[PDB]
Amino acid sequence: AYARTLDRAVEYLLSCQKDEGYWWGPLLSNVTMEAEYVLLCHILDRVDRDRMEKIRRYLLHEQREDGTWALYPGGPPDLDTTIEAYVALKYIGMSRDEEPMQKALRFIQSQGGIESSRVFTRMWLALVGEYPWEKVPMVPPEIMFLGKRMPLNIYEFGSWARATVVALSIVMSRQPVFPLPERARVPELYETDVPPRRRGAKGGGGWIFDALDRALHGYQKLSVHPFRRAAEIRALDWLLERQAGDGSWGGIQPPWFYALIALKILDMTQHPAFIKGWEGLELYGVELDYGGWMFQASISPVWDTGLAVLALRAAGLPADHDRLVKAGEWLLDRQITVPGDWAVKRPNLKPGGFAFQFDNVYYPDVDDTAVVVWALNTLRLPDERRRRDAMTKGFRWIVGMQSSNGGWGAYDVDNTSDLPNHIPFCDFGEVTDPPSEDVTAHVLECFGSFGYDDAWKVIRRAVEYLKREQKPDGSWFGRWGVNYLYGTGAVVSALKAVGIDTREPYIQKALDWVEQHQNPDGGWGEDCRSYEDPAYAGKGASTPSQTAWALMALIAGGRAESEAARRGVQYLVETQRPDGGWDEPYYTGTGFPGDFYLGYTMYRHVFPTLALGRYKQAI
Amino acid sequence: AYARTLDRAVEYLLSCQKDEGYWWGPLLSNVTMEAEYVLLCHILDRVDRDRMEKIRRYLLHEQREDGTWALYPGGPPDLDTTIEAYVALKYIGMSRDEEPMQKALRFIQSQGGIESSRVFTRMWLALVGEYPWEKVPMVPPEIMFLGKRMPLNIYEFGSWARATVVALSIVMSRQPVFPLPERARVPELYETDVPPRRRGAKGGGGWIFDALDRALHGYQKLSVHPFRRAAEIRALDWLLERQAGDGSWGGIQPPWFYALIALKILDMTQHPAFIKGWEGLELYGVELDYGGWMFQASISPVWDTGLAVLALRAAGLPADHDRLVKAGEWLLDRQITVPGDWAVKRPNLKPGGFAFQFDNVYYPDVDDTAVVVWALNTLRLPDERRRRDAMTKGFRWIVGMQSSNGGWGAYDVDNTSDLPNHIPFCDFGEVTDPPSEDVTAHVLECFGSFGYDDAWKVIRRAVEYLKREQKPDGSWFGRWGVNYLYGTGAVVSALKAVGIDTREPYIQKALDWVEQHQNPDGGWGEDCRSYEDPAYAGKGASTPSQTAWALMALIAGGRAESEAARRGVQYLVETQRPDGGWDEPYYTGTGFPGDFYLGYTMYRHVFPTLALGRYKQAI
Ligand SMILES: C=CCN(C)CCCCCCOc1ccc2c(-c3ccc(Br)cc3)nsc2c1
Ligand SMILES: C=CCN(C)CCCCCCOc1ccc2c(-c3ccc(Br)cc3)nsc2c1
Ligand SMILES: CCCCCCCCOCCOCCOCCOCCO
Ligand SMILES: CCCCCCCCOCCOCCOCCOCCO
């Protein structure tokens, strides 16, 4: 029955594999990536008419009927996104008259105009002189003086925010303006009677920071700022030291762009870092068949390859398949062997993790590491020396990464400070990197393959963490995936792997939750709205991946030979395409809960294959 | 008569011009460049058998009958050079038995062996474990803490030494060892009974430094060195901030190589700066027709182009010759507009100088600037705006670079400290960058073109400097050229240009000096030995360039229509080749008096053309 499906899905993945032996699916997000690219080019005075065109088609192609842009397909119109996308188009050529500009503008105004958008948006506009810098949350270069163990030192922030903060401090230090030609001036963004509904700090605004900011804006106006020169040079050095191998910073769009602006501001357009940083960009670009051009927020080569292997293995292929070996070998060359920002908290810990992208040695994440090691542990490579060796280094790194509560974070240890969550600046997505369930699950599932059970104290500490975090309805939050279906599936799958008894009450209470949300079409679905409104927890159009996740939670809990179980398998078997793939018009990936959603291209293929492979296992 | 010589020399120059419109002749030095390249590759574990082969040919090719290598063709055997060249070969494959290795070895031993070589040589050997680091002058990372105005702060050193010191501090901080295979171990370098005749500090060794060193060597052995970590990071950042566009540091072989080693030592082999820095090397490499491969100590594109223009112009070509315009345009894009290390002494001075190589914005030199501006001041470019503008910026920068005595330095102002000349480390070439005659001459000659004369205070101050420096025999020292013929020619030519009366006594006393050294063959020649032994001042085999220089001094002093004058012109006319070029088997360029000599490939062509062009002027 399903054998034909799996067989097809298998061959299909094998075709999607690159020559070097790795997998790499485009990472989808929203148009603020492209819109900001447009402004960046304008700032750096490097505009390519041909590129602008591809970006225009794309932007438009993504705008919806109502004339707006959302964070995820089928999501509500987003102000910020729409505003930036608006400015982008108007700069490329679009006249405020045209239908698109019209419908978009309307929505903008009906929301309070520019005054209701996130700091980033207002800041970008400030950069081109369409918004007063004085009304922008200030982040001083002096922040570079806070010691390792001080309130708000750059190391209390999450790896991604840290790099951005450092870069911007330089920018906000000079408050530069790169005037847009009259043709693209966007005054209309202000024309509105609707009361400006401004968004506040993530965890709440304390009158202290509220005032402190005002203080900084005043100090900003003085004629002399002692030691500021040395604060900037510190930020500069700091950035120069961590520029990733591909010329990017952290392998993400944000700090990368800002860092370049920071360099341009310091007349360093002749310096190597800038050059490399600039040309590095092309790698993240993607030529769309319909003539459009999108820019990836980040790239997932490692991740994809890692999961890809696991899937194919659980599917059936030999642990020494010549094709999987290509992957195995490739992965080994990717392992990071040098200290990264994490070292600040673990000086005596030996390097051994992995990164999300191709070359980003200073920021390996616990997630990728776990999956990569585990995936390697399932293979038979020619050089059993390096395979054995690497795994150990990766293993130990992870161990030494375990936070205080036994749960694992993404990039750092105990990065749980609650201070930065109140700064006027941080009003978008996460700013700290505390342990999450999904990550910790992938970790446990990693050790599990080696054989380490609940006996080992490490494991227990984690399980305790998971038990404590479980939601009332037996579900588990999805931090880097959408959502409860993602988390729950992760956990149950992990716990089952670490020897825990699947018969336990809290476990069963989870499985039941799964069955209770299975959509009529046989599959499972969870819309991103589940982050905003709880009524959507486990609700939404059925998707290949999300279905495959819930399917794993069931196969893991022994309920593999069940109704809901077989029902779901049917969905996958049916919905599958003639080529063996699968479609998924929705996002099942999460950047930040409620603020940034991602669509992992491979998920629709890899996970369904992994699930079917595991179903074919239970029989 | 000579006219045909000029027409031929001209058409030859124009042919040697590249497409972009610039001139660029290979810069010759000695084999320590290649020998050190070999060790570098070994250190960085990046050895290319094929390249090793091309290098081997070259090394042998340069070895003389006696089995040694000198600093300049026809020069005495050099210990350091020969030692390094020896180790290089023995590592490539050569067995100590082979005749070449034989003769070399005996010379080396007859000199006291390894114990008599410069610090650099002993250090390189220390790097591969063939010499005790303890017996190497120590340079601590802490030096990075000395403030702008303190004894021995990195800014008291000459631009070239500064960068090397910073890079080495990191290296000497860790005292790494990259063991050579037993096959290439060079113990025989010690086997000798001859008393080790060690070279001391450039300006004498003070018991203070001698003591301080021992002090630093002891401290080096402690278990904890507080703030050293910070010291290193200070040094690294200092390097990462000044890496030049082509990926080198300063555009010179020394700090470049050391800087890369410094990065290796710090596990940064996969950091942008390292990568670029490594692949930047190829540009300085040169494929020799006989199968060899040499590495340029530095490159002189700008310089050549600059002089090339002046020559051709004085020769006859229209100030708007479409070919000289290509040069004119090119040069303009080369002007530096950002602060460099010079800024430390002149914060309010506007950037406007030029560099020696293609892309080295932090180190423009007064010499190149003067020649480049002056050259431009003689052309008629399409964009008279930029031409006018560039000249002013360049000009003004030069004015603001003038030192206290009125003379001009190469890279910095008043870089006359006498402290660094006593450090145990600095025992090779120059370490500070004080004003020189030749440079100041090229500056005066520049303003001269604009019409500024002895009236302007700036010019008088200089003339006073030159008058005071003149040698008893009316000659003038040659700092960056070999030697008194080079300097004297420079000065007289300059003074004549700034309105000074060529009839003056001190002037005449100089001209006479020139006529008195004219060789029988009509031309003039000055061997590099003139730096070591005074009996060689103005003495040596005649060369095209040196002849052309003395010729300019005469044409300038009005003695153009003289015997010695016409005699010399004859030499150039006869010695010329069928293609219009000229041969010059000797070195007429100087890196450091008595320590490092260079051979400028273009000189033999450009200067003879300039001289003839000026002779044809006096008639
Ligand atoms: C899922 C397994 C492995 N993970 C471990 C890696 C996946 C996370 C990388 C994708 C998200 O990248 C980012 C990362 C950061 C951002 C920011 C951002 C937000 C606030 C600040 Br302050 C600075 C940047 N804006 S958009 C954005 C996208
Ligand atoms: C002539 C007009 C324009 N000039 C202005 C530029 C020409 C100077 C560049 C050629 C010389 O380059 C160097 C420059 C420096 C060195 C050193 C050296 C010596 C001592 C220390 Br301490 C560090 C490096 N060793 S070899 C060497 C070669
Ligand atoms: C400069 C000494 C080299 C030793 C490196 C250890 C530095 C301490 O790590 C603290 C964590 O900060 C992250 C550093 O890695 C980034 C690269 O910057 C280059 C210095 O190695
Ligand atoms: C960080 C302040 C930016 C102002 C630049 C002025 C540069 C300081 O001049 C002091 C002398 O050092 C010369 C610098 O060249 C190095 C480049 O590093 C870039 C700093 O902008």
Side-chain angles (χ1 to χ4, degrees), chain A residues 30 52 73 75 87 119 186 242 253 267 316 324 326 332 342 346 364 386 416 467 499 516 539 551 557 587 615:
Chain A
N30 67 57
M52 298 304 104
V87 187
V119 177
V186 286
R242 285 141 250 259
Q253 185 275 321
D267 296 309
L324 289 176
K326 285 287 296 182
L332 295 175
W342 51 269
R346 290 282 181 290
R386 196 166 68 162
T416 51
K467 286 186 178 178
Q516 293 180 54
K539 286 182 56 186
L551 213 48
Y587 277 17
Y615 186 62

Side-chain angles (χ1 to χ4, degrees), chain A residues 237 240-241 243-244 271-272 361, chain B residues 237 240-241 243-244 270-272:
Chain A
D237 298 316
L240 287 168
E241 308 182 320
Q243 172 168 52
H271 187 294
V361 295
Chain B
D237 290 337
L240 291 171
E241 305 184 329
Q243 172 170 51
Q270 50 183 180
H271 174 296

Side-chain angles (χ1 to χ4, degrees), chain B residues 148-443:
Chain B
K148 291 184 178 299
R149 69 295 91 168
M150 285 189 70
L152 290 196
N153 73 73
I154 70 167
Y155 287 104
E156 294 201 309
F157 291 80
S159 61
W160 58 85
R162 182 185 318 156
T164 303
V165 180
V166 181
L168 293 181
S169 63
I170 294 183
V171 185
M172 305 194 136
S173 180
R174 311 308 193 65
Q175 305 196 314
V177 166
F178 299 103
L180 298 168
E182 299 102 298
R183 195 199 69 64
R185 309 293 289 294
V186 285
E188 58 268 51
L189 296 183
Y190 289 108
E191 289 170 47
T192 291
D193 54 300
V194 180
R197 59 197 69 173
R198 192 188 298 84
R199 194 177 315 123
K202 295 304 302 175
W207 65 276
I208 314 77
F209 310 111
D210 187 63
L212 167 53
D213 191 64
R214 319 178 77 72
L216 291 165
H217 267 102
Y219 175 54
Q220 193 63 50
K221 293 194 174 185
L222 298 183
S223 178
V224 295
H225 311 75
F227 305 130
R228 168 149 292 182
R229 161 172 246 55
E232 312 190 315
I233 299 177
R234 288 292 294 291
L236 177 56
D237 290 337
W238 193 91
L239 291 176
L240 291 171
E241 305 184 329
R242 300 175 178 52
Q243 172 170 51
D246 54 34
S248 77
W249 270 262
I252 57 180
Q253 185 275 322
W256 189 351
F257 283 45
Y258 303 128
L260 284 167
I261 300 177
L263 285 170
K264 176 63 180 298
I265 300 306
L266 302 167
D267 284 310
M268 291 181 81
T269 51
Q270 50 183 180
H271 174 296
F274 178 87
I275 309 293
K276 181 72 176 194
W278 165 261
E279 53 177 51
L281 288 171
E282 292 309 306
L283 180 55
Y284 293 59
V286 186
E287 287 287 307
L288 295 173
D289 57 64
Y290 63 63
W293 177 87
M294 67 161 286
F295 180 97
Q296 305 201 65
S298 183
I299 56 185
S300 57
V302 170
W303 193 227
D304 291 319
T305 297
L307 288 179
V309 178
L310 292 174
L312 284 170
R313 288 291 290 103
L317 291 192
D320 59 56
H321 194 301
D322 78 303
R323 213 59 180 301
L324 298 178
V325 181
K326 285 287 295 183
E329 293 293 304
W330 188 82
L331 290 174
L332 295 177
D333 300 307
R334 292 294 85 69
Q335 187 163 52
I336 310 298
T337 75
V338 297
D341 277 342
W342 51 270
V344 175
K345 296 296 231 307
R346 290 282 182 289
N348 300 178
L349 185 59
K350 290 296 172 296
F354 298 74
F356 186 55
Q357 36 289 91
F358 288 117
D359 199 61
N360 185 40
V361 295
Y362 300 131
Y363 296 107
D365 61 286
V366 185
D367 226 333
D368 282 295
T369 307
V371 180
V372 177
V373 179
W374 165 21
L376 285 174
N377 178 49
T378 78
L379 308 173
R380 297 219 312 164
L381 309 183
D383 183 44
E384 270 300 306
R385 160 50 56 240
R386 210 159 63 137
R387 193 183 84 72
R388 196 76 61 189
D389 208 61
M391 286 191 282
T392 311
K393 298 187 174 186
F395 188 115
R396 295 186 176 299
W397 186 68
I398 298 177
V399 186
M401 286 302 293
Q402 182 174 56
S403 290
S404 299
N405 51 61
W408 273 272
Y411 300 99
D412 289 285
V413 182
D414 290 305
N415 187 287
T416 50
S417 173
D418 194 66
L419 246 301
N421 283 300
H422 306 298
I423 313 302
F425 180 67
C426 302
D427 77 311
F428 184 74
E430 300 281 297
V431 179
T432 53
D433 177 35
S436 62
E437 301 90 310
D438 54 319
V439 177
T440 309
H442 295 164
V443 173

Side-chain angles (χ1 to χ4, degrees), chain B residues 49 94 121 180 218 480:
Chain B
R49 277 295 105 185
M94 297 288 261
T121 305
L180 298 168
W480 304 88

Side-chain angles (χ1 to χ4, degrees), chain A residues 174 229 232-233 236 266 268, chain B residues 241-242 339-341 343-344 362:
Chain A
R174 309 309 192 66
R229 151 173 250 58
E232 311 192 322
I233 304 174
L236 181 54
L266 304 170
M268 296 184 85
Chain B
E241 305 184 329
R242 300 175 178 52
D341 277 342
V344 175
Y362 300 131

